[PDB]
Amino acid sequence: GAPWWKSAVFYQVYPRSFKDTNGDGIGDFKGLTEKLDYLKGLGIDAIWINPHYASPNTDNGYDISDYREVMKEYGTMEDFDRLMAELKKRGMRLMVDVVINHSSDQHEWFKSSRASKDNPYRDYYFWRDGKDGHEPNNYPSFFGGSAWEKDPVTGQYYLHYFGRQQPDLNWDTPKLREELYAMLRFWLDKGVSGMRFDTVATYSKTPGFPDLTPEQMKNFAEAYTQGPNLHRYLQEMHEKVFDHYDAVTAGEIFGAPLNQVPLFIDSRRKELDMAFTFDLICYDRALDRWHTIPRTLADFRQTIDKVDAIAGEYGWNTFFLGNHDNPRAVSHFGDDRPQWREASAKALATVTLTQRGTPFIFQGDELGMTNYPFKTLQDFDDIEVKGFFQDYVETGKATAEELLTNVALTSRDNARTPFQWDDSANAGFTTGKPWLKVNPNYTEINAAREIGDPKSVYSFYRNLISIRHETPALSTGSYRDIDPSNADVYAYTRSQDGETYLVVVNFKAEPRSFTLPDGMHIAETLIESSSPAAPAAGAASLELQPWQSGIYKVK
Ligand SMILES: [Ca+2]
């Protein structure tokens, strides 16, 4: 049989904004645990939680100070162990983020490492002499300025690809690799059965740290993904850890050229099981990271197609339209205006749950939650907005009003407003004051209202998940885009063991007539949204309502 993870439906929880149970305004482990019956009822097989480890939280929990302790704001280790027991009781699995390109500078390894040149933790990180009166080389940081930080205690510089407070761990040191492997087993032995390796392509560093060439400086992210031992280390990690568990592993791959994605995920290479890439979610983002660029459905489907193709015969992809760093799915890819929000949210659900790959639903997209109506730059928590203000408004490149208009559409805070449970105060997310304001549309868009209504976005997601579970072609089947050039209607087949299904989704808010491939005919309709009647058996065409979606078995 195919691995369990190829047919699983995953749900991403950003615990900080999911459910608060102690009134401090911050979502927590007990809140997630209390909502497992809700997620099980939706049909979820596995939940991916964002970083849940002890952290000073200078970088949203991706700066970890103790890999074997939990994030204090979310609760205690006993709360975590309860969560695991409650998932097991429900036959559900947990995936966690694994952030082992770097630790917090408050991690005890780094406090030990930095204290002297001669200690058993010195080589857990990268310490180098400077050169010509400054840094060891010209490496830039993803977060701006040099990737090298001098430490007066020893006079040497340490490497940080990301923030200054996120020193890179030294995978060239076998003792460090072994520490990391033992740490992973600590979580796997608690029952965790998924791990998502963040910034996985940067783990291997270039021997000798030579300067980047001028061409490389123009895309340093690509250069940092070309360490010569990268795949050797992932193969070692697979042998030492993952050969001994049924867990799924996923790589968060960026910076690298598309054609290297298969090196991480081809099953024959015994590295990782599946890929997270960002080609689709960033497909309409400008280079400045705050504007958008016009795109059509032809761009959307061609981007899906090239990533599906690169996984090919032996690799496997994840599929998502939303996560904790990006604007809301219905706002970004659908149409969130009142006439179209529900219709287009349902259409995007049909896409999500019929793509080839393992789908991840981001918390709240099953309700058709939308972007937040920011009115002032003061309404953003998003640290990135402050940086755009300095880089673009203070420099005179853009006005504060231009920034607000555009970052309202792209900001990660759109995905971080609290989950809208019901129409009580703060949508039932908290009895206190939420850490980030709830979208005022919660009075209309909330789980309580949607779970009781067979016509809701929630109910449609639930129904799709049930259909996907009972139809092997919709998870593990082949995929074929019928016309990558078509910018109105997304139509494609999924096929397995002689059974072929056709998915047809109108991306226009206008009626469209869709003609099937010549010789193809509808046999059965599995489900539709925004349609007043299924086609007749034998149909060779469809008349589509605005934003209609459907899944059909063909003859
Ligand atoms: Ca709380």
**Active-site residue, from 198, 273, 335, 413:** 198
| Rounded distance from Cα 20 to ligand 1 centre (Å) | 4
| Rounded distance from Cα 23 to ligand 1 centre (Å) | 6
| Rounded distance from Cα 82 to ligand 1 centre (Å) | 16
Q: Are 491 and 304 in contact (CB under 8 A)?
A: no
Closest CA to 269 of 293, 245, 247, 249: 249
* The two three-digit tokens of residue 402, written as one number: 């231009």
- Structural determination approach: X-ray
* The two three-digit tokens of residue 246, written as one number: 């049924």
- Measured CA distances, 12 to 46, 86, 308 (Å): 9, 17, 21
**Amino acid making up residue 229:** N
Residue 401 known to be catalytic: no
Which residues, by Cβ under 5 Å, contact ligand 1, an ion?
20, 22, 24, 26, 28
SS3 for 351-418 is: HHCCCCCEEEEECCHHHCCCCCCCCCHHHCCCHHHHHHHHHHHCCCCCCHHHHHHHHHHHCHHHHCCC
Spatial neighbors of 454 by CB under 8 A, at least 6 apart, are none
* The two three-digit tokens of residue 52, written as one number: 């849940």
Q: What does the DSSP assignment read for 92-115?
A: -EEEEEE--SB--TTSHHHHHHHT
What are 528's strand-pairing partners? 550
Angle between helices 174-188 and 230-240 (to 10 degrees): 40
Q: Are 347 and 529 in contact (CB under 8 A)?
A: yes
| Rounded distance from Cα 14 to ligand 1 centre (Å) | 13
Dihedral sign of CA atoms 417, 422, 424, 428 in order: negative
Q: What does the DSSP assignment read for 235-287?
A: HHHHHHTGGGS--EEEEE--SS-GGGHHHHH-GGG-S-SEEE--TTTTTTB-T
Dihedral sign of CA atoms 214, 216, 218, 220 in order: negative
CA–CA separation, 424 and 443 (whole Å) = 8
Closest CA to 302 of 30, 438, 87, 492: 492
Spatial neighbors of 41 by CB under 8 A, at least 6 apart, are 451, 462
* The two three-digit tokens of residue 499, written as one number: 């059974």
CA–CA separation, 89 and 87 (whole Å) = 5
Spatial neighbors of 390 by CB under 8 A, at least 6 apart, are none
Q: Are 533 and 480 in contact (CB under 8 A)?
A: no
E strand segments, 403-516: 478-481, 489-496, 499-506, 512-515
Q: Are 17 and 418 in contact (CB under 8 A)?
A: yes
* The two three-digit tokens of residue 75, written as one number: 């609760």
- Angle of CA points 319, 297, 544, to nearest 5°: 100
Q: Indicate the annotated binding residues.
A: 20, 22, 24, 26, 28
* The two three-digit tokens of residue 319, written as one number: 């599929």
User: How do beta strands 522-529 and 499-506 pair?
Assistant: unpaired
CA–CA separation, 365 and 460 (whole Å) = 12
Q: Domains in the chain, ordered, with CATH?
A: 1-103+174-477 (3.20.20.80), 104-173 (3.90.400.10), 478-555 (2.60.40.1180)
* The two three-digit tokens of residue 6, written as one number: 């190829």
CA–CA separation, 356 and 361 (whole Å) = 14
- Measured CA distances, 473 to 33, 267, 477, 500, 550 (Å): 32, 20, 4, 7, 15
Closest CA to 267 of 238, 241, 236: 238
- Measured CA distances, 158 to 53, 127, 139, 168, 209 (Å): 23, 5, 12, 8, 12
Q: Are 64 and 51 in contact (CB under 8 A)?
A: yes
Query: Three-state SS for 44?
Result: coil
Q: Are 340 and 546 in contact (CB under 8 A)?
A: yes
| Rounded distance from Cα 390 to ligand 1 centre (Å) | 33
Query: Three-state SS for 444?
Result: coil
CA–CA separation, 423 and 447 (whole Å) = 9
| Rounded distance from Cα 22 to ligand 1 centre (Å) | 5
Closest CA to 103 of 79, 146, 68, 150: 68
Closest CA to 42 of 428, 364, 458: 458
Q: Are 554 and 502 in contact (CB under 8 A)?
A: yes
Query: Within 10 Å of residue 68's Cβ, how many Cβ atoms?
Result: 12
* The two three-digit tokens of residue 140, written as one number: 């830039």
| Rounded distance from Cα 411 to ligand 1 centre (Å) | 24
User: How do beta strands 53-54 and 66-70 pair?
Assistant: antiparallel
- Angle of CA points 446, 448, 451, to nearest 5°: 100
| Rounded distance from Cα 39 to ligand 1 centre (Å) | 19
- Measured CA distances, 519 to 87, 532, 534 (Å): 47, 25, 19
- Angle of CA points 16, 289, 249, to nearest 5°: 50
Q: Are 554 and 517 in contact (CB under 8 A)?
A: no
CA–CA separation, 58 and 203 (whole Å) = 21
Closest CA to 466 of 109, 106, 41: 41
Q: Indicate the annotated binding residues for Ca(2+).
A: 20, 22, 24, 26, 28
Q: Are 134 and 220 in contact (CB under 8 A)?
A: no
* The two three-digit tokens of residue 301, written as one number: 């489907």
Closest CA to 147 of 214, 197, 207, 221: 221
**Amino acid making up residue 513:** S
Helices (H), 48-173: 77-89, 108-114
Which run of H or E residues covers position 474? Answer: helix 473-476
Query: Three-state SS for 150?
Result: strand
What are 543's strand-pairing partners? 513
* The two three-digit tokens of residue 481, written as one number: 């885009």
* The two three-digit tokens of residue 233, written as one number: 């280390």
Residue 252 known to be catalytic: yes
| Rounded distance from Cα 430 to ligand 1 centre (Å) | 8
**Specified resolution (Å):** 1.7
